[PDB]
């Protein structure tokens, strides 16, 4: 069973794509394994963990409540919005919107939340504030998934994303309650079955968020570890491949499987 | 059996009970409660970062409540997508459904959501159409030329497009 970097090289060869990967120790922040970690990749829905991080930061500051009801309109609806479209007539709470955005990649839910934090520019300012000088959101759903080659809009790097996730989930910056809530939404992810979850051994913890975009873009960010406790952050992104969704999912799962097989090697 | 499909969506009708819906859809494909309140949400094939799906809304939480709302994503393809940015720009708020369709193309659209809030009356019926240019629709990926046209009582209230011509 190949070592992680061996598997990544096999995957790039088979897909004709580019893979970006970081494996980071959660406690210490040390980088354990890295590949194209300073290259940009479209975030797709993976940005939604940062989004809801910014929302919780406002909650912590008394500027937001998860129970606050947001009412919206037809104008606000975009593709891939299964939950927000259902609740159009009734509205949704901020917390319900974050749950939909994270667990089901609900696009309109994310756009509604984005408006509460100042739009893409506002979310980018939040990133800069927590010391991420690389990650950027430029557009709203659904354009942010366009993944045009060489386009820096709506991208992160595996290194920056891993550091930022660590900051959001474990640093002083969010309250204990907010960290638990962000992590819980990731634990409850519903659309990540074919990826790391498909190769996760019995008894391990996982919390994750996925993304899919045009031009082959696909990704996952995850916290996982043995004994039902998070130990490491794993970020895997794919861009620039014409391969099928099945093949892209299988390769990401395979890279995850390699990291797991070589966990202590 | 299979997952949720366009054929199953079409066979499900306004006025049906929850059990009727579940019997056509295949109960293993469906869920209710949680994020979906007392509607029934049924998954089709994987698409993008989610699934093609249908969602059925009901007049109340009662066992005998009837379907008053049907929504779907990526269960149905447009007949002859001829929509263009030009035709989209000809569409105007206040237009009739007929006027709109004649404009964007009679085979350019599918029904995204249709809701009768006064069922069995049609008063206040809200309709969202998903319309597509020649290569705009995708059942498994991302649209590359589409528009959302929404109506109340059969009159256009607003419009929005992505990637047209």
CATH of the domain at A118: 3.40.710.10
Phi, psi (degrees; rounded to nearest 5) at A78: -135, 170
Residue ranges and CATH numbers for the domains of chain B are: 1-74 (3.30.1450.10), 75-165 (3.30.1450.10)
Other Cβ atoms less than 10 A from the Cβ of A123: the count is 23
Residue A196 DSSP code: G
Q: Which of B54, B59, B45, B56 is nearest to B139 (CA)?
A: B45
The answer on whether A209 is annotated among ligand-binding residues is no
* Catalytic option among A11, A23, A45, A160: A45
Which resolution, in Å, applies to this structure?
Answer: 1.8
**B35/A83 CB distance under 8 A:** yes
Q: Tokens in use for B40?
A: 């029934």
Q: Sort out which chain A residues have CB atoms less than 8 A from B50's CB and list them.
A: 80, 82, 104-105, 191
Distance of alpha carbon B122 from alpha carbon A237, whole angstroms: 48
Burial of residue B62, with CB atoms counted within 10 A of its CB: 0-12 exposed, 13-18 middle, 19 or more buried: exposed
Expressed as residue numbers, the domain containing A206 is 1-265
Solved with = X-ray
CA atoms of A106 and A98, how far apart (whole Å): 9
If one counts the domains in chain A, the total is 1
Whole-angstrom distance, CA of residue B85 vs CA of residue A139: 21
Please indicate if the annotation marks A141 as binding a ligand: yes
Exposed/middle/buried for A93, CB within 10 Å: 0-12, 13-18, 19+? middle
Q: How many CA atoms lie within 13 A of B99 on its CB side?
A: 12
Reported residue count of chain A is 265
The secondary structure element, H or E, covering residue A213 is none
Q: Which of A218, A262, A212, A254 is nearest to A104 (CA)?
A: A212
Do B90 and B84 form a contact (C-beta atoms < 8 A)? Answer: no
Chain A residue with minimum CA distance to B128: A74
Beta bridge partners of B83: B133
Inter-residue contact B62 to B82 (CB < 8 Å)? no
């Amino acid at each position: 069973s190949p070592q992680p970097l061996e598997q990544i090289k096999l995957s790039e060869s088979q897909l004709s794509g580019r893979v970006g990967m970081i494996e980071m120790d959660l406690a210490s922040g040390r980088t354990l394994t890295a590949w194209r970690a300073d290259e940009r990749f479209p975030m797709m829905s993976t940005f939604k963990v940062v989004l809801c991080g910014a929302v919780l930061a406002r909650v912590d500051a008394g500027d937001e409540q998860l129970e606050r009801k947001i009412h919206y309109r037809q104008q606000d609806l975009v593709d891939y919005s299964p939950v927000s479209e259902k609740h159009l007539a009734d509205g949704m709470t901020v917390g319900e919107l974050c749950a939909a955005a994270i667990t089901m990649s609900d696009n309109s839910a994310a756009n509604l939340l984005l408006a509460t934090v100042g739009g893409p520019a506002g979310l980018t300012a939040f990133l800069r504030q927590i010391g991420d000088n690389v990650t950027r959101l430029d557009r709203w759903e659904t354009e942010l998934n366009e993944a045009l080659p060489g386009d820096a809009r709506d991208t992160t790097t595996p290194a920056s994303m891993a550091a930022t996730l660590r900051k959001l989930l474990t640093s002083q910056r969010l309250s204990a309650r907010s960290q638990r809530q962000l992590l819980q939404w990731m634990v409850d992810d519903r659309v990540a079955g074919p990826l790391i979850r498909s190769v996760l051994p019995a008894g391990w913890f996982i919390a994750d968020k996925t993304g899919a975009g045009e031009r082959g873009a696909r990704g996952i960010v995850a916290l996982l570890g043995p004994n039902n406790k998070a130990e490491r952050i794993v970020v895997i992104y794919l861009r620039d491949t014409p391969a099928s969704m099945a093949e892209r999912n299988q390769q990401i799962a395979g890279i995850g499987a390699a990291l797991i097989e070589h966990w202590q090697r | 059996a299979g997952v949720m499909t366009g054929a199953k969506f079409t066979q499900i009708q306004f006025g049906m009970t929850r059990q009727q819906v579940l019997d056509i859809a295949g109960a293993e494909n469906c869920e209710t409660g949680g994020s979906f309140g007392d509607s029934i949400h049924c998954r089709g094939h994987a698409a993008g970062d989610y699934y093609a799906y249908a969602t059925f809304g009901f007049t109340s939480a009662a066992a005998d409540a009837k379907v008053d709302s049907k929504s779907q994503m990526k269960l149905l393809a447009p007949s002859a997508p001829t929509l263009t940015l030009a035709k989209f720009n000809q569409v105007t708020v206040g237009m009739t459904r007929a006027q709109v369709l004649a404009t964007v193309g009679q085979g350019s659209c599918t029904t995204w959501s249709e809701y009768y809030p006064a069922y069995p009356s049609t008063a206040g019926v809200t309709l969202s159409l998903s319309c597509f240019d020649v290569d705009g629709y995708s059942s498994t990926g991302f649209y590359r030329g589409s528009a959302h046209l929404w109506f109340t009582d059969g009159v256009l209230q607003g419009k929005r497009q992505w990637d047209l011509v």
